[PDB]
Subunit: 201 residues, 4 copies
């Protein structure tokens, strides 16, 4: 019975950084990929087979997410597709994820599907202010196209999809983390809880 | 070295019911009051002394303003708690609007929960809380909870409850309590019913109690 | 020379019904055959309830604030013909039977038509017909206090049943369907009918539409 | 004279709305002495900085979006003398030296005065001088997007310096001082100058004022 923890929130809120800090603090980075007890799943790894809105729920393989997450709860070994954000291509290589005790699924629409919601025993939402998240993504998108095209895409696609699809799913959260990776108190709270789950007490 | 946890949130958001559940799941109700390891401190007990305005029915008083709370005694009470000293907490009757001479003796505990609408208002009190929690229940939901709570627990009629809430409770929350939400480390979205968030904090305290 | 339609949305107990009333009253319009400004309510276009829906309404389990409870096709068809300068027949909903009475209110083509409804801006086809969109923004707890007083004193409801229906039906319908339509508003009028500066601004503008 | 206060966050559309309003009236093609609608900016009333204040300004540690950086006494005095029909002298601020130039702008008494500013509704004494209070409500991330593109083109700073100053100074000053003054607004104009319906609503209102 693996423990599934759903982490949602807008882009550049700190979902990936919070999950990375939790796994790093739990020492899972040093363990081999077979003996990993806490793994991280990114929703962007499940983009559907490909001016276009990639923040819309239709752009995500909802059935593959549900099947993979369900097979994880069944203790089965699953393979996750790889997706590069630059070329929008799903490479033929797959990441093999062996049965782990705790699974973190981060995604802007992780709480959108009701079938995916009920899979999570604990649901966390990284609530970061909209302008603050834009400041983080603007710096993130140039370092990792043109600055005018980044603001055009965010205003036309990212911002409307967050308010229409992500924001309504904030009410399904059990715990809200108010600033992201910098919130060391909240991270230490979840790190303490996942380590408490591994021990069994 | 006691662990101070600050619990804030608007009125009727569930801070009292959450804290009461945290100590109940920890079995502190079965332990004697002198041997309690997790105690609860309510900000409503530290209301300032009352003769500032004798008339509270002819002209209401606005009890939700930070001026009506003894911020100096709150800082003194919490400071002596962090030092490991026994403290005496005053008793209050909301109807009598007076400070009873009898005090509740709270022995040094390992974990102390302080719940209050303005628990994160003063900076000197904020830094004492090692963990800051905020119960963020929607405004209309908190109003529906408070109306039903104030009619059964108190003998107030509905017209005075809504008039007192709109005139004083609502503006004081938005001016003083809402800006303090940013200081919170963990936000609990719905309150007492959120069993996943309560079990998370209960487990954290039980790990602190073991050492 | 098409009629100037003005959409007025907002949550319940926000003041939109009183805002529209005070606008027509300040204009002195309230002569149904020669009136230049009329007020239309989304409440007139409730759908007729099936036998299973009527039974759910008696038990208090029917959401009257949900888009499914309104005849969007009738609203769109009525507002589309109003723009074309035609008389429209507007239903007179009988809530006792939850159906439309045989009698109907005849609205003659007016120069300015006000459509007031919680979900006035929900339908896109209905939304594009409005040349001006007003949203009465009043705080949720302030509107709740208004509705609780209006439901207990004017209607005589049970307090616990009001708050139970609000949390279960009224609140989710507002946050899911009404609030997302606030971004389509051209002008947002806060605090409701007491905002006399905003009302006199809309009253003055309609007078300029009639004089011009 | 009709005083209209315009507030809202940075890059919301305040300056663009006021400029668009004045343009729709003949005021652009109206002589300077005969202008009936004039625009006043709160940026013209920055305080002269103390040597201690200027020291923090050189270090980049002075929040220019804070109420203390604005000359409230001079704003109140100038706006009061405008209401009395007096011709007033507004300063010309030199932001490099943080002082007032010897040259001043002469504002002849106009029938309608538009005062735009981030904290136009902060001082109660300045609020009560406005016959109409407008607030340009635009989403924070949208305004930040507008400010970034405006701060890179208008000035010669880099992107990382803009976002650092916005998160450190502009954002906390807006949420603490500018946002709580939104409740005093009589009308809320969303999205700024792109809101043509709201622009023509104020334009038609001012035109009706000029004709009595
Ligand atoms: N008649 N009437 N008015 C109302 C009210 O204004 C509207 C709420 O949108 O639905 C109608 N309404 C709602 C609940 C109910 O139990 N009965 C009812 O008639």
């Amino acid at each position: 019975e693996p423990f599934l923890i759903g982490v949602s929130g807008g882009t550049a809120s700190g979902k990936s950084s919070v999950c990375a800090k939790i796994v790093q603090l739990l020492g899972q980075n040093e363990v081999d990929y077979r003996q990993k007890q806490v793994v991280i799943l990114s929703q962007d790894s499940f983009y559907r087979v490909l001016q276009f809105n990639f923040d819309h729920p239709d752009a995500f393989d909802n059935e593959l997410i549900l099947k993979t997450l369900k097979e994880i709860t069944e203790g089965k070994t699953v393979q996750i597709p790889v997706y590069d954000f630059v070329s929008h291509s799903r490479k033929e290589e797959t990441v093999t994820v062996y049965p782990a005790d705790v699974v973190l699924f981060e995604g802007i629409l992780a709480f959108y599907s009701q079938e995916v919601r009920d899979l999570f025993q604990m649901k966390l939402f990284v609530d970061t202010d909209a302008d603050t998240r834009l400041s983080r993504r603007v710096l993130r998108d140039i370092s990792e196209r043109d600055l005018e095209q980044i603001l055009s895409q965010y205003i036309t696609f990212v911002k409307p999809a967050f308010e229409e699809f992500c924001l309504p799913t904030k009410k399904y959260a059990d715990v809200i983390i108010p600033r992201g990776a910098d919130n060391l108190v909240a991270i230490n709270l979840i790190v303490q809880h996942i380590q408490d789950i591994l021990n069994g007490g």
